[PDB]
Structure formats: structure tokens, C-alpha cells
Symmetry: C3
Subunit: 104 residues, 3 copies
Amino acid sequence: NTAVVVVLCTAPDEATAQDLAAKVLAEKLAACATLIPGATSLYYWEGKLEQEYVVQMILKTTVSHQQALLECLKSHHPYQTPELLVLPVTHGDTDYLSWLNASL
Amino acid sequence: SNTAVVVVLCTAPDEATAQDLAAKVLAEKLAACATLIPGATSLYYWEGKLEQEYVVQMILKTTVSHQQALLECLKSHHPYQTPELLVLPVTHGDTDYLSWLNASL
Amino acid sequence: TAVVVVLCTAPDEATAQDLAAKVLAEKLAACATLIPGATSLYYWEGKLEQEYVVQMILKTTVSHQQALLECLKSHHPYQTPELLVLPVTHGDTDYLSWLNASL
């Protein structure tokens, strides 16, 4: 039904999530971005449980653009190994999908 | 045996509308559950410039057999012309939860 | 190994942090993002309920998914908590590498 995909990326703060989004959108590697602030991320680091504040990003693009988008985000992300995951979209409204493709 | 389940993404302009859209699709049994995350920000280009809106992220859970009708219903009552309507697959899940999800519809 | 994203909700911040802490300590997940301030609407026994919840998003591999859900369900206060798995078709290599290595 669609090659559109959603990319998950974790940002340390709103300002960072903000220009990462602005950046990829300007480059047209993403059609749109949703930012969900107020979260924390837990993970182990050197036998220690780390917790940090984060903003969950949800970007929309396609499989033909996924790699290019990931690299752009990677290059501008302050973290060394930021979370960059691609989730497949099995279906979507036709008008919304057309709008996303047109934006890319 | 359970029918394939999916997660639907949709965004509403405010909490009032989010709860309203959710309550309707749940009443019509087009979705088994809805999670609403307020305070989100939607960024996208429109007419050549970057737009930014405060929105509520909706995460609706239903089955592949209902997705179509769910999307149709959400779009029918949604405040704007072309709302976010994306369907993500659930390749695995707790059997009991998936059963409640299914029986719920 | 293919990785996946797991969605689970907790009735409160403490439960969410405790659930993430133990699955990570058990090395059944690489990381978990906790998002407070959410709401869950659903019908229960013919009634519309709206409960406060913290949205959890956990990252692990397809090899640990079954084990991760069992552990989360085991320690979760609810009898039948939301436990759903979504596939990841692609991802940054270094990140996917770390994710696997963390388990």
C-alpha cells in the first residue's frame, strides 16, 4: 500500500529536536516531524543504569529516502550513536500519503 | 486464533478533539483502545515555509479488518482536510492482550 | 539480529521506572523511553474508561521479544497489560550494533 515509513530518533532536548527536524525538512528528507517532549530514557552504561531527559521524535519519509534521512540526522545529532530506527507503514489514507510524497 | 493487530497514528489539534475522536471510534467499535499524548509538536512545510503546531498524538489499536473503517471514521470527523492517518503493523504481542483487543471489536 | 520496538503502558511513573529498570537489568531490553502525561481510553465491561498512563517504548531484538513480554507482564500490576511488538525494517548500523551488543 505504501513505501512511506516512520523513523524514530531520540533527542536530548527540544532545541536539538527542533533544528534536527527543521534541518531534515528543509533538505526535504522528511515530509513532517512530530516531537514528544517530557520523556526520559533509561539504558545501561558501564555496569551503571543511566537515565536522561529526552524528546521522542517521529519523522515520516519513504524507504527510498530512509538511508539519506538517517545519515542527515546522524551527521547533525550531538550524540555519537543516536537512536535511528525505521518502522514500516503498512497502510495510510491516500490523501495523506500523497501529501507526504509530494513533500519529499 | 486472533486477527492481526495494528497501531494507528493520528494527530489532533487539541485534547478536546482528541478525546472526542477517540470516544467516537471506540463507541463505533472501530478501535479497541486509544492512547493520547498531549503537548506534542508537529513540524512540516506548507506553502514554502516551516509550520509548527501544538498537537496531541493519538495511538489507536485495532485489527487489520477494521483499519480501513477506522481511518474512514477518523477522517470523516477530523477538523482538517488531510489528517495524519498511518497504520503500523504489530508483528507480535501478548496473547491475552491481543485476545482482549480482538474480542473488544 | 532484527530489532523491534515494544509498547507497554504503566499506571504510574514509579511503576514505569521499576519495569524498565528490571527488564534492562535482566538484559531483556537495550533501552526504554518513558513518556508521562498520557491517557488511555477504552471500553471495559460496557463502560468508557480513561486512565492516566506513562507510555513506554522499549528496544530489544526479535530473539528477546518473547522473554521481554513475559518479564514485563510478570512484574506489571495489571493482569493483562498492553504488550505490543512492532518490527524495525532498517536502522543505523552503529546503533543496531550497540543495541545487539547491549544484550
